[PDB]
């Protein structure tokens, strides 16, 4: 009995190891990891593997090098094929905190120019290249080589300065990362590192940029239509 991957992922999301994967649509799934907070509730991320002809790409490690091993042998296990690079969403610790275990695998990383320069600081790696984006938030192409169908808009600052976010053209997919949270959303979790003055813009610019995305994908809540965005931006306003 030798089913796909889409057809194993019929029955539902697909616990592995400490991981869960979601198929989101026929080349693209949703992992989510999880941090132990010691005495409460584990801390769930999610980020995206997209199948992308004979290569795998990346949106975002796992919070650890374990965890995002993991997630290279669910890729090795389920795709059986080679995962070509990775874009990882801003510098904290649930979207670079697995960069060592991506670059040990051969993969090319790639993050906001900003999320490199604050990742070592906080006893993170940096991913190997640097993107830059125009005034108008899209990225330079010349710093984007052979991304596929991976669109990347930085949106202004949010949820952290550095925020990035992902459309994968092709599909009805945009992914958010932590800028965005579900239109149920009781908060818009962990501000620390917020610009608490523009976090409402910069989800507005999200949802201006990926327009045909009817799928918001994000880090911190489960797939959502657009009503998201707007939540959020509710959700921000003021603060
Ligand atoms: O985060
Ligand atoms: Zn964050
Ligand atoms: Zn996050």
Redesign the pocket.
Same mark, same amino acid.
């Given at each position: 009995i030798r089913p796909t991957i889409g057809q194993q992922m019929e029955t539902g999301d697909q616990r592995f190891g400490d991981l869960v994967f979601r198929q989101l649509a026929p080349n693209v799934w949703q992992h989510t990891s999880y941090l132990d907070m010691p005495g409460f509730g584990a801390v769930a991320s999610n980020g995206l593997i997209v199948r992308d002809g004979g290569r795998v790409l990346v949106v975002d490690t796992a919070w650890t090098d374990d965890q995002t091993a993991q997630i290279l042998n669910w890729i090795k296990q389920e795709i059986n094929l080679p995962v070509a690079l990775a874009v990882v969403t801003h510098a $904290?610790q649930?979207?670079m905190g697995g960069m060592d275990a991506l670059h040990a695998a051969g993969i090319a990383t790639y993050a906001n120019a900003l999320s490199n320069q604050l990742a070592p600081q906080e006893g993170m790696v940096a991913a190997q290249h640097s993107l830059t984006f125009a005034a108008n938030g899209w990225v330079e192409p010349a710093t984007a080589p052979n991304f596929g169908p991976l669109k990347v808009f930085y949106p202004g600052p949010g $949820?952290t300065s550095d925020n990035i976010t992902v459309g994968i053209d092709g599909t009805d997919i945009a992914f958010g990362g932590?800028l965005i949270k579900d239109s149920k959303a009781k908060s818009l979790g962990?501000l620390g590192d917020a610009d608490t003055e523009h976090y409402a813009a910069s989800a507005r610019a999200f949802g201006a940029a990926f327009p045909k995305a009817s799928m918001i994908v994000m880090?911190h809540s489960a797939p959502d239509s657009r009503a998201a965005i707007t939540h959020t931006a509710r959700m921000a306003d003021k603060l």
């Open positions: $904290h649930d979207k $949820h932590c962990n880090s």
